[PDB]
Amino acid sequence: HTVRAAGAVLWRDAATVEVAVIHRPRYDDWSLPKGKLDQGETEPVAAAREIHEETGHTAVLGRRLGRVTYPIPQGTKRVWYWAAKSTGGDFSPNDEVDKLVWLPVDAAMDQLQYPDDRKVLRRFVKRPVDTKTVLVVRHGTAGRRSRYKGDDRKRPLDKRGRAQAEALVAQLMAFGATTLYAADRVRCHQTIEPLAQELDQLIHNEPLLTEEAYAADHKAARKRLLEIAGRPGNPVICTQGKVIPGLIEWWCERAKVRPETTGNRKGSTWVLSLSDGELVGADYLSPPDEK
Numbered sequence: 001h002t003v004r005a006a007g008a009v010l011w012r013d014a015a016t017v018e019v020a021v022i023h024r025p026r027y028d029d030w031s032l033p034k035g036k037l038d039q040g041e042t043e044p045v046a047a048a049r050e051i052h053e054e055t056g057h058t059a060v061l062g063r064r065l066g067r068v069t070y071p072i073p074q075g076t077k078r079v080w081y082w083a084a085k086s087t088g089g090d091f092s093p094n095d096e097v098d099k100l101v102w103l104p105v106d107a108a109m110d111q112l113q114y115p116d117d118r119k120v121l122r123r124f125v126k127r128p129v130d131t132k133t134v135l136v137v138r139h140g141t142a143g144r145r146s147r148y149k150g151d152d153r154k155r156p157l158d159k160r161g162r163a164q165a166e167a168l169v170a171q172l173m174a175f176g177a178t179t180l181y182a183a184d185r186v187r188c189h190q191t192i193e194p195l196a197q198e199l200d201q202l203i204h205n206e207p208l209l210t211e212e213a214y215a216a217d218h219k220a221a222r223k224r225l226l227e228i229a230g231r232p233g234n235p236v237i238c239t240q241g242k243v244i245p246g247l248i249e250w251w252c253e254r255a256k257v258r259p260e261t262t263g264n265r266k267g268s269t270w271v272l273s274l275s276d277g278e279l280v281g282a283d284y285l286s287p288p289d290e291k
C-alpha cells in the first residue's frame, strides 16, 4: 500500500538562492516541506497546499525533482518533489513546524538530515530553477471516434472528461498558468474552458496543432510550439494524442532533456520548464483522476 505525498524545495532570491528547511518537534527533524495528498488531490496541488500550510508561503511550482520512497506502518511513503519559487508569506512557529530557516544550498545540504532530501536538493541544484513553463495538455475523455474519416471535429468531452477539465484548473494554476491555447477541435477547447473562466482569459485557437495538420505539416507545428513558448507568460496548450508525443520527443532530443516519466493519457499534462529559452525539464503528469 502506498501513502502518496508531495512537497518541494521552496526557494527565494537571497545556486545563490536560499531554500527553506523546516523543523518538526514531533520527530525533532529537519527536512523539506511536504504532505499527504487529500482526497481527489493531484501531487502538484498537494505540494502547493502543504508548502503553504507548513511554511506560510504561497509559491509557483516549476521543475519536478524526482521521487522518494520509504517504509512506514501503513506500507510505503511516496513523495514527489518540485522546485517552488516563493511568492510571499510569513512563517509562524507552531506545534507542527516550529522553525523554518532560509539557507543557501550548500548550508541546506548540511542542515537536511535525510539522505533522500539531500538527493532531492542535489537535483535542484543540477539545473536552473528560475524557470518559465509551458503546459502541454492532452484533452480529456471524449468518447470513442466515429466510423467516419477524420477525427470528429465537434465531438465533445464526456462526463468524465468534463470532470477532468474542472480538476485541471487547480493542477495548471499550481504552475502559474497565464495564457491559453487549444488545437482547433471542440474537445481541446472544452478541456481548458474551466481554466479560461478562472483566469477570465480567452483561448487562442491553433489550427496548426490538430492531428490532421501535424500529419500534413509537422514542421509548421514545431515552429508554432516554439513561437507560443517564446511569448511572455506561462502558456497552456491543449492538443491531441498523435501530436503530443512527437512534439515532446522532438523537444527533449534537441535539448538533451530526459523525461523521468512518460505517458500520453487523455487529461495528462507535460510540464516543460524553460530557462533563457532552453528546455531544462519535461515532466509528465498523470490525468487528475488517475493515481
Ligand SMILES: Nc1nc2c([nH]c(=O)n2[C@H]2C[C@H](O)[C@@H](COP(=O)(O)OP(=O)(O)OP(=O)(O)O)O2)c(=O)[nH]1
Pocket: 005, 027, 029, 031, 032, 034, 035, 036, 068, 070, 072, 077, 114, 116, 117
Ligand atoms: N520528512 C521525511 N521524513 C522521513 C524521511 N525518511 C524517513 O524515514 N522519515 C521518517 C520520519 C518520521 O519518523 C516518519 C514519518 O514522517 P512523515 O514525514 O513521513 O509522515 P507524517 O505523516 O508525520 O508527515 P507528512 O507525510 O504528513 O508530512 O518517517 C524523509 O525523507 N523525509
Ligand SMILES: Nc1nc2c([nH]c(=O)n2[C@H]2C[C@H](O)[C@@H](COP(=O)(O)O)O2)c(=O)[nH]1
Pocket: 027, 028, 029, 030, 110, 111, 112, 113
Ligand atoms: N535537531 C536534530 N538534528 C539532527 C538529528 N539528526 C541529525 O543528523 N541532525 C543534524 C541536524 C542538526 O544541525 C544537528 C542536530 O544538533 P542540534 O540539535 O544541536 O542542532 O544534526 C535529530 O534527530 N535532530
Ligand SMILES: [Mg+2]
Pocket: 033, 034, 035, 036, 050, 054
Ligand atoms: Mg508534512
